[PDB]
Amino acid sequence: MLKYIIPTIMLMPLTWLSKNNMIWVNSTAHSLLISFTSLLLMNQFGDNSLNFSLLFFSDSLSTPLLILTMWLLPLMLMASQHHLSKENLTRKKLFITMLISLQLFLIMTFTAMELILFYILFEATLVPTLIIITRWGNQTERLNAGLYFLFYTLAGSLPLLVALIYIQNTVGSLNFLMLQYWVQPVHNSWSNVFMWLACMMAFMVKMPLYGLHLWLPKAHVEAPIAGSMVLAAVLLKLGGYGMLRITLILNPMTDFMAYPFIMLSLWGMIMTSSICLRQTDLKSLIAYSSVSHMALVIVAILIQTPWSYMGATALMIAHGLTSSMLFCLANSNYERIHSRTMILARGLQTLLPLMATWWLLASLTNLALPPTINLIGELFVVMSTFSWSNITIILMGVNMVITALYSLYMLIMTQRGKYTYHINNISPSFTRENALMSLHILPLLLLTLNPKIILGPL
């Protein structure tokens, strides 16, 4: 509620209004504080969900999901600091403003009270993200990532507004989710498929199916300095949750056609992870993880029958961190050596000993050792999706193999002798290198102690 948007918009002139170089520490100081407010009135119910205003129930829903969104902001200025210190302050004042200008809508969205505040705010980004990709790129291939990032996201999300304005005047008012207490079903026709297909395909083009992901590595391979907005674009994607607000209801009873979204993404899950093994560019190698065990949720959501939402929620915020943090490693190791080519960096682990245990705990949580959230987020997937049909144990059982050769080959490539020609790579990871790389593995594993705070209603 205004408890949140108002201070975080109050942030906005906490920055430029300041002096010279004090700016970074000025806003990083406050931006942490809001996290007390983040929890503050939140983590109330529980049962019979919280709605505190007419057009906002901040998050009740058991999709808390908002606490993270308020984390990643003052993880950027620790992240983004590296080469952004080399241009002017009135531009550096900008890049902190639009970056907030993103953070303000992700608080608006995830609440939205309804469908039609979601959408205009579901499309309300792409103004702030697109401007961070095109400027402050690195290569010159960036200019095409500008377009491809649109012309999909916007391409098929217009058929929403044709459909959601079609519901508003058909049955009552969509003004509120919390009233669905009248919903008739959707039986069949050659019209209703389209309705269901229009109310869906806009979401898929964000969390990729194995088709129409053609943009995802185009934008991430070449993308701002620190992953500065690349950490944010790994929040944006998973935020396609809203399919959890719809497909639970609002055409419940068409599962009839589900199968082309099952067998299409269920054989890609065994697939695009395997086209990730021979990659020669590291920020590509991680970008294809992000498809894979993200695209497993799309077979979690379509199937009804909780024990999937038990396991589908834990995943949106499962790689929400692990897949975040890897883009933070591959950034750092790139500061020192200016190729992103994976081969070139070898013979590390002697020269940066403390950063050894940083790779490991990262690459260990794609392996998903049993105790952490990762498996307890996957093993509620397999338990329901097994009951669907027994044969799902094979493919998604293969996923649990190729992903293990997948991860290690990234670490074990950095255990070798190489002294080779590098006179660079002196800096022994000054604190920010290891400070911002923490505040992930500390908060991540921690939740396993009381992991009832990440769960759906079911």
């Binding site: 170089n21 970074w24 800096s427 604190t431």
Partner: peptide, 24 residues
């Protein structure tokens, strides 16, 4: 970025301030 200063974020002072403002 080592003229044998120790350093974390940027320069002489508030760098020292900038570490206690993150850690704490």
């Amino acid at each position: 970025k080592n003229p044998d200063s120790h350093g974390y974020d940027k320069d002489p002072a508030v760098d020292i301030w900038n570490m206690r403002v993150v850690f704490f």
